[model samples]
Target chain A: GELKAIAQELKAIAYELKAIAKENKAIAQG
Target chain B: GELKAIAQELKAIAYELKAIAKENKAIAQG
Candidate 1:
C-alpha cells in the first residue's frame, strides 16, 4: 500500500540520515 | 524494496526541490 511504502521509505531515509551524520562527525574529527 | 523506494522518494524530493532555493529567495525578498 502507499502508506506502508511511504512509512518504510521514511524509515530508510531516517536511518540513512543517521548514518550520514555519524560519517560526517567521524570525518570532521578524523 | 525498502531501499529502492527510499531512493525513489529521495529522487522525487530532490526534483521537487529544484526551484526551492529560488522560491526561498523570492519569499525572503518579498
Candidate 2:
C-alpha cells in the first residue's frame, strides 16, 4: 500500500515536470 | 529501504528534468 502511494506521488510529479518542460520550450521559442 | 530507493529515483528524475530545462533555455537563446 505504501509503495502504491509512492507510485502515485511519482506520477503526479512527472506530470508537473512535463508541464514545466512545455513552458520552458515555449519561452525558448521567444 | 524500498521507500528510500523510490526517493532516490525521484531525485534522479528531477535532475534529468533540470538538465532538459537548461537545454531548452539555451536553444531559445539561439
Candidate 3:
C-alpha cells in the first residue's frame, strides 16, 4: 500500500536512525 | 503541485505556546 518508493525509503531511514541512537547510547555508557 | 499556492492554508491553531516566565530573560532560558 505504499504510495511510492520514497515512502519506504523514508521509513527505512527512520528505523535506521532509531537503531543508531540505541547503539550509540549503549556504546557511550557501556 | 504549485508550491506557493499549496502553502496558503497551513493550520497553526494546534500549536501549543509555552508561557515564558520572563519575556527576555536569556537566550537559553526557554
Best by DockQ: 2
For A1-30, candidate 1 gives per-residue lDDT tens digits of 666666765665565555555555555664
DockQ of each: 0.06, 0.34, 0.05
Scored against the native two-chain complex, candidate 1 gets a DockQ of: 0.06
Model 3: which residue pairs collide? none
Candidates arranged by lDDT, highest first: 2, 1, 3
Q: Please write out the lDDT profile of model 3 over residues B1-30, one tens digit for every residue.
A: 333222321211111111121222332343
> Which regions of candidate 1 are displaced past 4 Å?
B1-30
TM-score, chain A, per candidate?
0.75, 0.93, 0.68
- Model 2 over residues A1-30: C-alpha lDDT tens digits? 889678667867777777777777677765
Candidates ranked by DockQ: 2, 1, 3
Q: Candidate 2 — what's its lDDT?
A: 0.74
At residue A12, give the lDDT of candidate 2. Answer: 77
> Using TM-score as the measure, what is the rank order of every candidate, best first?
2, 1, 3
What ranges in model 3 sit over 4 Å off? A1-3, B1-30
Off by over 4 Å in 2: B1-19, B22-30
Clash pairs detected, candidate 1: none
Better of 1 and 3 by lDDT: 1
